[PDB]
Amino acid sequence: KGFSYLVTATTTVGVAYAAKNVVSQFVSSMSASADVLAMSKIEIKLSDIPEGKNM
Amino acid sequence: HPLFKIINHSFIDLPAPSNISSWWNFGSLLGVCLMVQIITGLFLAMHYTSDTMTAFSSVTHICRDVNYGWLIRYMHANGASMFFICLFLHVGRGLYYGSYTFMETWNIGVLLLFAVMATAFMGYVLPWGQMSFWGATVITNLLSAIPYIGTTLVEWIWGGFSVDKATLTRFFAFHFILPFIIAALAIVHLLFLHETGSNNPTGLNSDADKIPFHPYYTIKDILGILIMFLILMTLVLFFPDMLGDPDNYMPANPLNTPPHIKPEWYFLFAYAILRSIPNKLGGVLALILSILILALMPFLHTSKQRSLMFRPITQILYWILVANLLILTWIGGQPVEHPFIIIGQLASISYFSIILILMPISGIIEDKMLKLY
Amino acid sequence: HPLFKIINHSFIDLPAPSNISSWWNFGSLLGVCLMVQIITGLFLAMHYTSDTMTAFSSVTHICRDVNYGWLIRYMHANGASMFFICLFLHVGRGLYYGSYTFMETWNIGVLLLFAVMATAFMGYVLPWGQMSFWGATVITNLLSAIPYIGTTLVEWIWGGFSVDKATLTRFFAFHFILPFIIAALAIVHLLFLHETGSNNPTGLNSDADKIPFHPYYTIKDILGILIMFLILMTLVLFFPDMLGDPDNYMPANPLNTPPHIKPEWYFLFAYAILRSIPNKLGGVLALILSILILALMPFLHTSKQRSLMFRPITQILYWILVANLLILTWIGGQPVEHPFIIIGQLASISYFSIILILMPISGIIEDKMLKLY
Amino acid sequence: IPSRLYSLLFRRTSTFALTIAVGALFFERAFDQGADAIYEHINEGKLW
Amino acid sequence: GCVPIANAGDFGGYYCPCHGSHYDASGRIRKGPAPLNLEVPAYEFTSDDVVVVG
Amino acid sequence: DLELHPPSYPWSHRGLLSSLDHTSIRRGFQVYKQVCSSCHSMDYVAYRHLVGVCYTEEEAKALAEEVEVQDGPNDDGEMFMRPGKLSDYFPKPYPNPEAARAANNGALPPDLSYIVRARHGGEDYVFSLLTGYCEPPTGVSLREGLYFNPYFPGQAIGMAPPIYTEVLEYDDGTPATMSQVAKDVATFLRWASEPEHDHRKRMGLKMLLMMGLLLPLTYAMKRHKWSVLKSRKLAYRPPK
Amino acid sequence: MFMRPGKLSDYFPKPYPNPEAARAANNGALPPDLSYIVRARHGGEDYVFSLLTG
Amino acid sequence: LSRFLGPRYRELARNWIPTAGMWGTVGAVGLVWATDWRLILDWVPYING
Amino acid sequence: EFGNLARIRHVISYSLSPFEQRAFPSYFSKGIPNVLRRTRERILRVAPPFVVVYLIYTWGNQEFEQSKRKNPAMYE
Amino acid sequence: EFGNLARIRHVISYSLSPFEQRAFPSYFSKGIPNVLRRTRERILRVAPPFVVVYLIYTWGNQEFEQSKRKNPAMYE
Ligand code: HEC
Ligand code: HEM
Ligand code: HEM
Ligand code: HEM
Ligand code: HEM
């Protein structure tokens, strides 16, 4: 029994490892793409705003 | 053909109760509305573009340059409104006549209700107006309430830091794909019901009086379809903007926020509840429970009579429940200021107390009056 | 339980023949491929834009900026190729083993085949490359062949004078919506098969030897799924473009025609036939018949034995049919010049004469050899 | 021998699942590590 | 997640027309149902005329 | 049609499990920047992509801040220009297709982003074309703005030899022979047409390994659950 | 670029090439698209009349 | 519930308890692994990284 | 299905052909009385919740207005 | 379903438990002979059509080339 089931248990981990990987990339696809992620360093001119104002 | 058997088994030789009123039409209307939505949605999909630069332009191109494209677009919008009208009356029929004792049918129903609400929300986001963008941010933000994984989930759905093209395109895909899942769930809904047959307004065993469906409840469904089409076309051809918001006819400005943010009217009852609870999380949960309380409904039936035809105290409590559901629909519309808030808080307290507490106690009292308890 | 009953009767205990070979795996593979396509298609739909200015840009954005977006796109393309491989082997199994005597199952099958070919054609139009645009114009032009209403129909589909954005957007809508109709037609397919049960390679009544499906043909389908996934991932991760057209990586230039225009590997057999017939209309018709001849197949069975396991002359004719199907696939690729044309003309004549004439005459001769006729 | 294993982690289905899950949790670590070694070495001098 | 409207409200800072959250000039939530103060991005005051906000 | 079919070259990115040489991609990007960018465009490639391929973040920015880009509308509404950003795409060598057509004697230098993928046997073709400007034979005559490149369709490419030995100097110092330059730019263009070439092949190795484990096993489980029947020994014992 | 007399297929001409020019020319205010103004303004037809006459 | 406040009912549960815990354990391990939860995985020496 | 639905005994059931009977026998003759009969058995259970919804709605509106109305005493 | 599929009589059927029997009994021992046995019963029906497909394919290619090749005598 332990020989036959160990094969079932072995296979499972393997499938389990692939299944998490497949599902992981998919899940990851909906995450932010490279284009958006690459957003930073907005430049702001202090002179633009005077006291009592928001921009 | 073997299929003809299935064709007959569910629509021709199906034994139906002879005394079911016009309310039993409504579910069939929902199915028709689903098809109508799908058909109109398909004819919106041949010209709509899910790009934030071109979504509003594509919608205006549909309304102005496609032959009868305004007709199909406003049929789609007012058919979503008609879908929610028929859905609310279907759920009210199920609550009033004790049809929730068909527990599997009821649970597949509340799953269908959740799917339809998600589909309508993403569809309202789809035209990319001012109101759609601020509405999306708002409800997507609702998710952030989650205690630990909230932020991630929100960002996932948005597909970025804030709703932007990333969202619009995936919302187009999801809004396209969910009504077919709704159709499959409706097939499961019909199956879980034929195993038990429909209920009657008296709530009694109608096995002694059943009639065919082809000549008796088919022409009745055809007449109900004709009346629903009359109301839908007088909503489309005469008052095409009485249910929508004017601010959705402006383009989506992330810099400009509207002075008052609403979802469309059928989300209002929920909106009220959310606003009522002070805690953000509390609101989200209560909101969910608002819909989920229904699923919980078959475990709260403590009466020996299935329907409310012979139960006057629970009839009074039911109409008070419909009354403060209308009150919560009104409050959602009202802005945040006295005394709209207090009503909202009470109305939510009264809603949950009538569904959770008052109806089983009233059913116990009604059983005591008939010398049954 | 009325939802689980279906599975028990259909997937867990269905009485299946004990001796069906690996070819009977293929249809289940097709179902898996359908889901795979749908899943990958959904994850292409969250970033694809059906605008002629932005379709190629959205496809490149999927391949370059979406996390593992190249993986999902090339899985979708090579899964369409795997779908057609499994479809051709499924149809070849049905032709070889006499499974076309299940006539309703066969007719629902050829309807599914037409729907899958239309879905793949519009999907190949969708990335809006050079090859997609010239390919679309070509087949849309095929319709113009219609004797009287052809021009109108073509213009209708195109939605304008010539394929342009009008087409792309409606092709996106139709390519989105048809695989769900394919799934429903597959339910009707398996349905009409449940009423009969599967065939076996000997072609005999297997009622004396049937086994369950859960432990015997489930692990077999799991192994076939694993092997098909191995071939699909070695097609995606190692030779991704081996099954594509380099000219589809250029943007669509309505002004220029890629010189080596050719339909994908699976449409070639048809392409050859179309090119073979001199008359345009003739080509279109023959093309259609090419697929339709199959539907016609259950009325051409003149043998007293269902399968070809014990029929060697019709086995030889079947392998000659597979041979000139491969020849027609090659010819389609070859350009218009001697002697590719003549082969095409003969190969088409031999294809229609083997299916229409030679196999029933051979079955009559085989019945005469066994002292049956 | 496996016997000891079987009677301990492979005979009770609950434990069967436990061994599977735990093994899978670690397998990824090992597989990724081993696999990377193979790939990187094959292309050593070309990475980065 | 709405936009607070600057130069409006009962705390001379901000007001969000969505549910009535009043933020002071510091952007701290002072009245209403907003849970936490507005976020301050990690900017950079390179100059009294140049500020690199994240 | 009748066209010379470029031979197979022993590249390194061909190996089933072999990744692109990244020094060659860096050299080919230098070749594109100094030679090919005057006429060809790279609309779907932006500096950020390079990061993690042959350049670091800071270096990439260096590259980015070494070019000028327009910057939408000014507050005044007047379009202005800015130092290139890691988010900026590669600059257009011609604002509009017409400009390119005009400058390049009617020829539209095709965007070299997917050229390798768009040209049959691209990597080879590219190398061949760039290294195939041989003299037109007797009997063929080409008009101005045309060149007899056997590989090019029609053997009349508008582009002139774009690579003269020592056309540009490789920063790495590797001798800038015409070939060393054509091989580098073919590797780079290849990379351009498939920035994921390396990442994919890794998965491939991994997939094979997994199948090489799961496939054999799934077979043992199937043969366990099918042994029962495959050992069935029928027997007919009529009453007799 | 080049300018040509409008065609029946031409849309109505822009007053400004971009909204920031509208901000610069209208003292920081953006005059909105009047295509759907009546539909976008609550009680638009009335509002319009009232505003223009108010 | 009246029927579930029972002596054997309790015995059954007690006998069932261990198995139940095992299942939760599998899921917990599963969730940690599937989500690649690093807060938890950071504890494991080899799994780290 | 039909035939196995239920067991009844000695319940005779007479009926007429559609074309043999008037389509709308005494439609407004008794319809009105009945509709009215119906409304008086259900009006006391149905109507007073919606009546107090109308009162609460009006009240809210007016109260809100008064709330908005400037406090004369304030600012003076 | 099972139980009503067919009528057989006096057909005894012996079998063994999966774990009691070797997983791959004589797998390559007889597998090879059998696979070879199989190939020789089907090769004459299967292979010669694909052989003449290979000949026609090559022929077409060559013939096409010759067709394309230039005849020097043509120009004179
Ligand atoms: C850097 C060494 C390169 C490389 C690798 C290529 N070019 Fe150019 N190119 C130019 C023009 C005007 C054309 C079009 C000419 C025509 O169509 O007649 C091209 C074309 C190409 C191609 C496409 C070939 C095809 O079959 O379509 C390719 C692969 C190519 N080039 C490679 C102009 C120029 C330049 C301005 C003088 C220079 C510099 C380059 N090209 C440089 C390169
Ligand atoms: C599979 C079938 C469907 C398709 C293909 C589809 C497709 C579309 C498309 C393309 C749009 C954008 C065009 C527009 O702005 O109106 C849209 C909008 C919308 N859809 Fe659907 N739809 C489908 C089914 C449904 C269903 C079942 C509902 C109801 C739950 C629904 C609700 C909406 C709503 C509310 C909008 C927004 C309408 C507006 O702009 O005001 N759709 N749909
Ligand atoms: C997607 C929209 C829906 C469709 C298309 C649909 C369809 C149907 C149909 C055709 C019927 C049978 C005819 C009838 O009795 O009216 C029915 C009955 C029923 N449905 Fe739905 N339904 C929908 C939503 C719901 C929801 C949301 C619920 C749960 C609240 C629900 C619960 C029920 C119940 C309990 C019945 C039994 C009626 C009775 O015997 O009293 N349905 N539905
Ligand atoms: C409802 C599910 C599906 C959706 C949402 C979907 C969506 C898409 C989208 C957005 C594309 C364009 C992206 C790309 O270029 O690859 C596409 C391409 C394609 N789809 Fe689908 N698809 C679906 C199902 C299918 C199915 C079932 C087939 C097979 C018949 C199929 C065959 C194709 C093909 C051949 C392409 C072209 C791939 C290429 O660019 O080479 N799709 N699909
Ligand atoms: C859309 C793609 C298709 C799917 C998903 C599909 C699905 C299936 C499935 C699950 C089975 C049962 C398992 C099996 O015997 O392989 C089956 C059997 C069958 N299918 Fe299909 N099928 C497809 C296409 C076709 C086509 C195009 C035809 C017609 C040529 C066809 C005709 C049959 C027949 C005759 C059987 C019976 C097999 C036998 O008993 O010998 N199928 N199909």
Whether ligand 1 lies within 6 angstroms of the CB of F163 is answered as yes
CB contact under 8 A, B261 and E2: yes
**Tokens representing residue F6 in the block:** 């470029």
**Tokens representing residue B167 in the block:** 């969202």
Q: Which residues in chain H are closer than 8 Å to A20, comparing Cβ atoms?
A: 33-34
Q: Which of B208, B327, B334 is nearest residue I53 as measured by Cβ atoms?
A: B327
CB contact under 8 A, C327 and J53: yes
Whether ligand 3 lies within 6 angstroms of the CB of B189 is answered as yes
Angle at B187 between CA B183 and CA B191, to 5 degrees: 165
Cα C65 to ligand 4 centroid, rounded to whole Å = 19
Which residues have C-beta within 8 Å of that of residue B104, sequence separation ≥ 6?
B192, C2, C3
In the block, tokens 């149809």 appear at C91
**Tokens representing residue C229 in the block:** 């996934």
State the nearest Cα–Cα gap between J20 and chain A, in angstroms.
9
**Do the beta carbons of residue B133 and residue B263 sit within 8 Å?**
no
N residues, chain J = 76
3-state SS assignment for residue F160: coil
> From residue I64, how far is each of I57, I70, J33 by CA, in Å?
10, 12, 94
Q: Which of I2, I8, I64 is nearest residue B337 as measured by Cβ atoms?
A: I64
> From residue F119, how far is each of C241, F27, F127 by CA, in Å?
12, 22, 12
Resolution of the solved structure (Å): 3.4
In the block, tokens 């057999």 appear at C269
**Tokens representing residue B72 in the block:** 């199909």
Amino acid sitting at position B45 = A
* Cα gap E36→B326, rounded to integer Å: 33
> From residue J37, how far is each of C22, C106, C318, J40 by CA, in Å?
18, 33, 22, 6
For residue J13, give the chain F residue with the closest CA: F234
* Cα gap C262→C243, rounded to integer Å: 13
* Cα gap B261→E18, rounded to integer Å: 6
* Cα gap C158→C168, rounded to integer Å: 9
**Do the beta carbons of residue F169 and residue F176 sit within 8 Å?**
yes
* Cα gap B372→F83, rounded to integer Å: 86
* Cα gap F27→F184, rounded to integer Å: 6
**Do the beta carbons of residue A13 and residue A5 sit within 8 Å?**
no
Q: Which of B329, B218, B180 lies closest to B267, judged by CA?
A: B329
Strand-pairing partners, residue E22, are E15, E31
* Cα gap B125→B176, rounded to integer Å: 13
In the block, tokens 């805690």 appear at B279
Number of helices (H) and strands (E), helices first, in chain D? 2, 0
> From residue A43, how far is each of A40, A46, F58, J29 by CA, in Å?
9, 10, 19, 77
**Tokens representing residue B15 in the block:** 């034994």
**Tokens representing residue B65 in the block:** 């340059």
CA dihedral F83, F87, F90, F92 (to 10 degrees): -70
Solved by what technique? cryo-EM
**C210-211 and F233-236 strand pairing:** unpaired
Considering every ligand atom, which ligand is closest to the CA of C121?
4
Catalytic-role residue among E19, E36, E42, E46: E19
What are the percentages of helix, strand and coil residues in chain D, rounded to 5?
Answer: 80, 0, 20
Question: What is the SS3 assignment for chain C?
Answer: CCCHHHHHHHHHCCCEECCCCHHHHHHHHHHHHHHHHHHHHHHHHCCCCCCCCCHHHHHHHHHHCCCCHHHHHHHHHHHHHHHHHHHHHHHHHHHHCCHHHCHHHHHHHHHHHHHHHHHHHHHHHCCCEHHHHHHHHHHHHHHHCCCCCHHHHHHHHHCCCCCCHHHHHHHHHHHHHHHHHHHHHHHHHHHHHHCCCCCCCCCCCHHHCEECCCCCCHHHHHHHHHHHHHHHHHHHCCCHHHHCCHHHHCECCCCCCCCCCCCCCCCHHHHHHHHHCCCHHHHHHHHHHHHHHHHHHHHCCCCCCCCCCCCHHHHHHHHHHHHHHHHHHHHHHCCCCCCHHHHHHHHHHHHHHHHHHHHHHHHHHHHHHCCCC
**Tokens representing residue B42 in the block:** 């398909």
Q: Is B120 exposed, middle or buried (0-12, 13-18, 19+ CB in 10 A)?
A: buried
**Do the beta carbons of residue F128 and residue F6 sit within 8 Å?**
yes
* Cα gap C200→B252, rounded to integer Å: 62
Q: Which stretches of chain H sit within 8 Å of chain D by CB?
A: 19, 22-23, 25-26, 29-30, 32-33, 44, 46-47, 49
Whether ligand 1 lies within 6 angstroms of the CB of F146 is answered as no
* Cα gap G31→G24, rounded to integer Å: 11
- H helix intervals, B215-358: 218-236, 268-276, 280-296, 312-333, 340-353
In the 8-state DSSP scheme, what is residue B357? I
Q: Burial code of D15-47, b = ≥16 C-beta within 10 A, e = fewer?
A: bbbbbbbbbbbebbeebeeebeeebeebbeebe
Torsion angles phi and psi, residue B106, rounded to 5:
-65, -40
* Cα gap C269→J22, rounded to integer Å: 47
**Do the beta carbons of residue B293 and residue I19 sit within 8 Å?**
no
**Do the beta carbons of residue C273 and residue C287 sit within 8 Å?**
yes
* Cα gap F127→F183, rounded to integer Å: 6
State the nearest Cα–Cα gap between D23 and chain A, in angstroms.
7
Considering every ligand atom, which ligand is closest to the CA of C38?
4
* Cα gap B61→C298, rounded to integer Å: 50
CB contact under 8 A, F237 and J10: yes
* Cα gap C249→F116, rounded to integer Å: 9
- Give the number of A-C residue pairs with CB atoms closer than 8 Å: 32
Q: Is C209 left (phi over 0), alpha (psi -120 to 50) or beta?
A: beta
* Cα gap C60→I42, rounded to integer Å: 66
* Cα gap B275→B263, rounded to integer Å: 13
Which residues have C-beta within 8 Å of that of residue B253, sequence separation ≥ 6?
B130, B133
3-state SS assignment for residue B333: helix
Torsion angles phi and psi, residue F206, rounded to 5:
-60, -40
Q: Which of I27, C316, C13 lies closest to J50, judged by CA?
A: C316
Residue spans of the domains in chain C: they are: 1-373
Sign of the dihedral through C-alpha F76, F78, F79, F81: negative
**Do the beta carbons of residue E19 and residue E31 sit within 8 Å?**
no
3-state SS assignment for residue I8: coil
Cα B244 to ligand 3 centroid, rounded to whole Å = 27
Q: What is the largest CA-CA distance in chain D?
A: 50
Torsion angles phi and psi, residue E51, rounded to 5:
-130, 120
Sign of the dihedral through C-alpha C7, C13, C15, C16: positive
Which residues have C-beta within 8 Å of that of residue C279, sequence separation ≥ 6?
none
Torsion angles phi and psi, residue B67, rounded to 5:
-65, 120
N residues, chain I = 76
- H helix intervals, chain I: 27-68
Sign of the dihedral through C-alpha F83, F86, F87, F92: positive
**Do the beta carbons of residue E9 and residue E22 sit within 8 Å?**
yes
Q: Which residues in chain D are closer than 8 Å to F209, comparing Cβ atoms?
A: 31, 35
* Cα gap I12→I22, rounded to integer Å: 23
In the block, tokens 């195939």 appear at F132
- Give the number of B-G residue pairs with CB atoms closer than 8 Å: 20
> From residue F70, how far is each of A36, F40, G21, I76, J25 by CA, in Å?
19, 19, 17, 59, 74
Which residues have C-beta within 8 Å of that of residue J44, sequence separation ≥ 6?
none
Which residues have C-beta within 8 Å of that of residue C41, sequence separation ≥ 6?
C76, C176, C179
